[PDB]
Amino acid sequence: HGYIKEPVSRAYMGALEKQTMGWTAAAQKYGSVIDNPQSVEGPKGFPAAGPPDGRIASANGGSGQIDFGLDKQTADHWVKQNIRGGFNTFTWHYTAPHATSKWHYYITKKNWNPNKPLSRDEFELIGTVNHDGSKADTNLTHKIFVPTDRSGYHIILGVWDVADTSNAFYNVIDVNLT
Ligand SMILES: [Cu+2]
C-alpha cells in the first residue's frame, strides 16, 4: 500500500481535500478513496491485463477497498497541478512497502479525450524502473522523462507492481503540462 505523493496523485489529492473541504464534500468529489489514498490496488500485468478500461483510475474499486469515484473523467472534475516537460521526479509514500518487481509510468497521448472514461489505448509508456524484488522503499523516488511534445491537461499514470502477489497499485495524476 502506498501512493504517489509528489506530484500529488489524484488519490492523495482526495485525502488532501478531505482536510480542506471535509469528509462529505471530498467524498462527493472523489469517493471513498479520501480515507485510503494508499489502497488503489488491482491486478498487475498492465497494460495487457490489469484493471479494465473505464476502471484504471480506481483500479476497479481497489480490490474492494474503495468505490469507483476516481473513474469519473471530465475536463473540469479533477485538480490539475503544473508540471514541465522533461525530467521530473515521482516520489511514492508507502504505508506498507512490499517487495517490488517494477514501477512503470505512462502519459496520455497528445490527442486524448478528457471527457471519456480512461482507456489503456489513450496511454503511452514513458519509463520503466526495474527493481530487484527488495522492498519498495529502497527506491522511493523515480526520475522519469515526461514527453516534451504535448501540453495542457494530461494524465500521468504511475503503476507499482508487487513482486510476491498478483496485484499492483494504479495512481493517476492530473497535470497541466507546460
Ligand atoms: Cu499493501
Concatenate the DSSP letters of all residues of 94-131 into one string. Answer: ESS--BEEEEEEEEE-TT--TTS---GGGEEEEEEEE-
What's the distance, CA 121 to chain centroid? 16
* Deposited experimental method: X-ray
Matching residue, cell 493517476: 172
Distance from C-alpha of 24 to C-alpha of 174, rounded to nearest angstrom: 22
Q: Which among 155, 168, 175 has a CA at the least distance from the CA of 39?
A: 168
Distance 160 CA to ligand 1 centre (A): 11
Secondary structure (3-state) at 46 = coil
Q: From the CA of 63, how far away is ligand 1's center (Å)?
A: 11
In angstroms, rounded to a whole number, what is the distance separating the alpha carbons of residues 17 and 11? 10
Strand partners, 163: none
Give the number of domains in the chain: 1
Residues 6+ apart with CB under 8 A from 30: 10, 11, 13, 14, 17, 69, 70
| Sheet with strand 141-146: strands edge to edge | 2-6, 86-94, 141-146
Quote the ligand 1 centre to 53 CA distance (angstroms).
23
Cell of 71: 473513474
Q: What is the extent of the structural domain holding 127?
A: 1-178
Distance 135 CA to ligand 1 centre (A): 11
How far, in Å, is the centroid of ligand 1 from the Cα of 70? 19
Ligand 1 center–CA 97 separation, angstroms: 7
**CATH code of the domain containing 92:** 2.70.50.50
Helix locations, the chain, DSSP H: 10-21, 23-30, 59-62
Q: Report the distance separating Cα 118 and Cα 39, nearest Å.
A: 19
Taking the C-alpha atoms of 131, 132, 134 and 139 in order, what is their torsion angle to the nearest 10 degrees? -30
Å from CA of 96 to ligand 1 middle: 5
162 CA to centre of ligand 1 in angstroms: 9
State yes or no: cis peptide before 47, omega within 30 of 0.
yes
